[PDB]
Amino acid sequence: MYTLIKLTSEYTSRAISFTSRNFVASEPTSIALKLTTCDFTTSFQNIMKQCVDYGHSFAFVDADDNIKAQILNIPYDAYENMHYGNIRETDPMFDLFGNLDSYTPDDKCLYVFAIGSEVTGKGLATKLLKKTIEESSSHGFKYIYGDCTNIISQNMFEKHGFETVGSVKYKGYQYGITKPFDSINCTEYIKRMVKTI
Numbered sequence: 001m002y003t004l005i006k007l008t009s010e011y012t013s014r015a016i017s018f019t020s021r022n023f024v025a026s027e028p029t030s031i032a033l034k035l036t037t038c039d040f041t042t043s044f045q046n047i048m049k050q051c052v053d054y055g056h057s058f059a060f061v062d063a064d065d066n067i068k069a070q071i072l073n074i075p076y077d078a079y080e081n082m083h084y085g086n087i088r089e090t091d092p093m094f095d096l097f098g099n100l101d102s103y104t105p106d107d108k109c110l111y112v113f114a115i116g117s118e119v120t121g122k123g124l125a126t127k128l129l130k131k132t133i134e135e136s137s138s139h140g141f142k143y144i145y146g147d148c149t150n151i152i153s154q155n156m157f158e159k160h161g162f163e164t165v166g167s168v169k170y171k172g173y174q175y176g177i178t179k180p181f182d183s184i185n186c187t188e189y190i191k192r193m194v195k196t197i
Ligand SMILES: CC(C)(COP(=O)(O)OP(=O)(O)OC[C@H]1O[C@@H](n2cnc3c(N)ncnc32)[C@H](O)[C@@H]1OP(=O)(O)O)[C@@H](O)C(=O)NCCC(=O)NCCS
Pocket: 022, 023, 026, 027, 028, 069, 115, 116, 117, 118, 119, 120, 121, 122, 123, 124, 125, 126, 127, 147, 148, 149, 150, 152, 153, 154, 156, 159
């Protein structure tokens, strides 16, 4: 069926594409901003590559080694110093997320940049999150942080012991005179969620 793997460098191109496509198709903030995969890859390919290279990311692959679900994780200290391919299309995204960067870890922390699954309702994302919790413990991380934009992942994180430490309401959020997130209907907040290991 599908095999749980630790992502390695040979999967980098597949990992970048998987999250780009998955988020552009199905993640609330990307959809709200009408991002294309070009927009997403430009802004986020660096962090996605680093999620693979730091060694703490996981995926489910099919028999032909295609990624069907993945979780891209990176140490928080690398996240805090991350560079992005900034473009006008994603400026409001960075503005929104920036609000959550005020709650910071006081010890070793693993940051979940992205979780996604193209084969849904089969437990794949849940299993990736549980694997990530095991990984965090094994490497002496004290916290896992995620900025979760989707009610589905918020509930999943809650089910696995995460607590909300910060939030921003989508409806009414402004970037200058624009209201770029008012189109979101599935989810009311973006939330920074923290699990203490
Ligand atoms: C969110 C996402 C990762 C879920 O992955 P998935 O593999 O279906 O999730 P799992 O099957 O492990 O299911 C996890 C839980 O979500 C629930 N769930 C999954 N899809 C759901 C849906 N469309 N509506 C309501 N609940 C849903 C499951 O029922 C399950 O809960 P339970 O076990 O308590 O019943 C997937 O929908 C996705 O990739 N979305 C685009 C990506 C995204 O937005 N990522 C998060 C950004 S924070």
